[PDB]
Amino acid sequence: PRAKTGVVRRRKHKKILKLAKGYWGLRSKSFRKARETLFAAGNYAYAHRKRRKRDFRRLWIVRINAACRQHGLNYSTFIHGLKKAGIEVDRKNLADLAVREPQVFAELVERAKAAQG
Amino acid sequence: MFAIVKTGGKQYRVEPGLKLRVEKLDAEPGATVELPVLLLGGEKTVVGTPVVEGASVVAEVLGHGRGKKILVSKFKAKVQYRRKKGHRQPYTELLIKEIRG
Amino acid sequence: RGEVAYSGRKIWPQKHTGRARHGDIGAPIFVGGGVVFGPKPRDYSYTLPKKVRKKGLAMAVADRAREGKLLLVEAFAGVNGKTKEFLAWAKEAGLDGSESVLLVTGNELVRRAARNLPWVVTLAPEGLNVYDIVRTERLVMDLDAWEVFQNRIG
Amino acid sequence: MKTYVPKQVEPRWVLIDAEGKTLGRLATKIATLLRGKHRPDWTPNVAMGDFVVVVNADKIRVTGKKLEQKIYTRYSGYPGGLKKIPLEKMLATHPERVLEHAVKGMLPKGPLGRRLFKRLKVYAGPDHPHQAQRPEKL
Amino acid sequence: MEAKAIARYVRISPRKVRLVVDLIRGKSLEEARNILRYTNKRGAYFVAKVLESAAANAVNNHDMLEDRLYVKAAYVDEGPALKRVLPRARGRADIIKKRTSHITVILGEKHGK
Amino acid sequence: AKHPVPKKKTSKARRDARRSHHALTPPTLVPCPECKAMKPPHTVCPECGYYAGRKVLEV
RNA sequence: GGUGAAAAGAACCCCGGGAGGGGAGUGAAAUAGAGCCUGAAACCGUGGGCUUACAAGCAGUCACGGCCCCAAGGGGUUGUGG
RNA sequence: GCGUUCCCGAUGCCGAUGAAGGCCGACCCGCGAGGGCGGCUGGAGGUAAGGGAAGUGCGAAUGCCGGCAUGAGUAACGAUAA
Ligand SMILES: [Mg+2]
Ligand SMILES: [Mg+2]
Ligand SMILES: [Mg+2]
Ligand SMILES: [Mg+2]
Ligand SMILES: [Mg+2]
Ligand SMILES: [Mg+2]
Ligand SMILES: [Mg+2]
Ligand SMILES: [Mg+2]
Ligand SMILES: [Mg+2]
Ligand SMILES: [Mg+2]
Ligand SMILES: [Mg+2]
Ligand SMILES: [Mg+2]
Ligand SMILES: [Mg+2]
Ligand SMILES: [Mg+2]
Ligand SMILES: [Mg+2]
Ligand SMILES: [Mg+2]
Ligand SMILES: [Mg+2]
Ligand SMILES: [Mg+2]
Ligand SMILES: [Mg+2]
Ligand SMILES: [Mg+2]
Ligand SMILES: [Mg+2]
Ligand SMILES: [Mg+2]
Ligand SMILES: [Mg+2]
Ligand SMILES: [Mg+2]
Ligand SMILES: [Mg+2]
Ligand SMILES: [Mg+2]
Ligand SMILES: [Mg+2]
Ligand SMILES: [Mg+2]
Ligand SMILES: [Mg+2]
Ligand SMILES: [Mg+2]
Ligand SMILES: [Mg+2]
Ligand SMILES: [Mg+2]
DSSP, X not given: OOOOOOSHHHHHHHHHHHHTTTOSSTTTTSTTHHHHHXXXXXXXXXXXXXXXXXXXXXXXXXXXXXXXXXXXXXXXXXXXXXXXXXXXXXXXXXXXTTTSOHHHHHHHHHHHHHTTO | OOOEEEETTEEEEXXXXXXXXXXXXXXXXXXXXXXXXXXXXXXXXTOOOOOTTOOSSOBOEXXXXXXXXXXXXXXXXXXXXXXXXXXXXXXXXXXXXXXXO | OOSSSSOOOOOSOSSSXXXXXXXXXXXXXXXXXXXXXXXXXXXXXXXXXXXXXHHHHHHHHHHHHHHTOEEEEOOOOOOTXXXXXXXXXXXXXXXXXXXXXXXXXXXXXXXXXXXXXXXXXXXXXXXXXXXXXXXXXXXEEEHHHHHHHHHHOO | OOOOOOOOOOOOOOEEOOTTSBTTHHHHHHHXXXXXXXXXXXXXXXXXXXXXXXXXXXTOBOSSOXXXXXXXXXXXXXXXXXXXXXXXXXXXXXXXXXXXXXXXHTSOSSHHHHHHHHHOEEOSSSOOTTOSXXXXXX | OXXXXXXXXXXXXXXXXXXXXXXXXXXXXXXXHHHHHTOOSXXXXXXXXXXXXXXXXXXXXXXXXGGGEEEEEEEEEEOOOEEEEEOOGGGOOEEEEEOOEEEEEEEEEOOOO | OOSSOOSSOOOHHHHHHHGXXXXXXXXXXXXXXXXXXXXXXXXXXXXXXXXXXXXXXXX
């Protein structure tokens, strides 16, 4: 018996092409330029998923700094103050307190420079 | 009020009545309520009061519909002569409805 | 690529065409071309240990019997090989047709009778074999045959 | 889950006169201001720092020797011309640039950075004929 | 209501006719004819000609009424190329392809308030 | 078939971009005092001819 | 190589020199209309939504924001930042 | 492990209340290869569980056959006897 390609290949191709929808030239039109583009896209996303975790760290840290430097002191001092005070709190993430409810943050600052006074 | 709960190794600002996902909890039934760790006050007329891991007795009560959900992503790794797709990760989620501070 | 109808002339200079290097168009990169590891005529038979054949035939009947599906008949009121007749007979025999039957007898006539029935697989006694035995739900043999069987193995 | 993001904010002008200052130590500040790194709304994709006007360039002090010492290569013409002009000279002739070059230099490279630099207004002061909000920072 | 025409296998090259079809897309039939009338291009002939047929059809088959109608959309599509040999130096032999057009005009009626 | 030769299939985009100037200009046209007609300016045309005009024919 | 069960293969009228098409008519079906079953892809077009003329690129990806079809969410698009 | 062709299973079963194949899908299952389910097309085939056998999976071979692009509305249109 002969088993010719038959359907198979077209289908495996459409699969890839479905994924490549939106890309520029034949990167979205060519059942292989597409596949090339897709490899990269995979790696970039993996790389970038890890990146995201850091991109935000940074926002935050800059968030915090501007805001507590606003009550006169380093992010670094602030953070050490906190550490020294004990405050699993914040999580650089949750100094959005820096923005909504400053009063909270303000107090946190005092606590921070408290354990540094 | 307010409150900064800690769960799933992550912390969130939980409000009078809401939710998002937290990560599979052994709270086997949907029809249940766990209280999670408090961590900073809230500022309203009920307080404004933080503290060293807020182990101040106070809890946040949250009930929760849910099911270890999923989603999508697809984690493809690639080199040169080496490819690996063998990751559709979805990721167990846990939905919730926070009840009171 | 040899079995193929073409010539063997080499199609291009091989060296300054600016096309790919090629021989004759028989070669299987060619379409025109010949098949690569195609099937050839071959003999799929092999000598399965006589003993195993015996064991099997025994094992097979055995099985059918440990189920209560083996029946040794004797009465064949069916004659001249007439389907009507075998039918009626199979009736007050228990064989209603809701079950595929391998009828085994040496009786040329009972063969003819039971033959054309879709739910029956008629067979001489020297024809007894496991495939057929297993194909079918119920097993029915005239002692005539049950002896030759009992004699293919004692 | 959370997030942070700001809704369009009204920009806030600002006036500074580092007439006596070391450019670059000044300029460094002027940048941080340009991108809003001082505000705790800060969002990197969006452009929302003060506007920043500066009267009295000339004036800007500069450390060691930059009498024909600090040389602005800056200009590659096109065919055989790498025009270089010593610091003295800039000040001597359109001196507002000294602080401009400085600030543009410490601004990010993209379209946005390109945009923030526009938000900087430098005049060889005093007098920034140009303000209807000037709020002096120091 | 619209009325359409289509000339199939016209045997001018698309790029070439499209050019004039672009000229009349969305004009009053009046404007359309005028334009084609004095458009210096082989394609003029053809396109105009199928314009006319469209108009006919409209009026005649779809009680549509001349005075009111314009070119709703138009467009040319490639048909199957006629492939001819064209012999070259050092006896090379290229294939020139005389292409072939499928011109389509569809009129609608304009206003009345 | 020889010396200079293009190094890349040119993208649809770039092809089309080149043709941003190829669009046709509609013929320039006018009344004609005698016919309700349309003719190019500065031409006699197949009817109207002219006032003291030469042309097909007129009564 | 292949219309259809059957030529029932489109009378007649309309534009056109014709080709071609529009009606009419046959057909269960005519984007089954005659190199006609199915009719993928490259490729060419028409319409629409988002987008674009101070911008630097393996063309993706990550985050935010805006606009466009359904509503604690999705889909399409892409301005800026990484 | 997945999937392709074929055999047993099959005098069966699914099928015009629509097979195969094609086009969608932001849904369900699977780590994945895939498998489903829904809509449209399509119009006559398909073929479980469990096994058996192979012409069994393509992106590259200046591979092969074919189709269609790019250069491009470009060079050219074959004696300057008009
Ligand atoms: Mg193959
Ligand atoms: Mg290597
Ligand atoms: Mg030979
Ligand atoms: Mg030889
Ligand atoms: Mg070569
Ligand atoms: Mg070559
Ligand atoms: Mg052959
Ligand atoms: Mg063998
Ligand atoms: Mg039978
Ligand atoms: Mg020759
Ligand atoms: Mg060519
Ligand atoms: Mg285009
Ligand atoms: Mg037939
Ligand atoms: Mg169809
Ligand atoms: Mg059909
Ligand atoms: Mg058929
Ligand atoms: Mg067809
Ligand atoms: Mg378009
Ligand atoms: Mg500029
Ligand atoms: Mg712009
Ligand atoms: Mg750009
Ligand atoms: Mg980017
Ligand atoms: Mg076959
Ligand atoms: Mg049925
Ligand atoms: Mg049904
Ligand atoms: Mg099949
Ligand atoms: Mg092979
Ligand atoms: Mg390979
Ligand atoms: Mg080829
Ligand atoms: Mg050229
Ligand atoms: Mg030229
Ligand atoms: Mg020329």
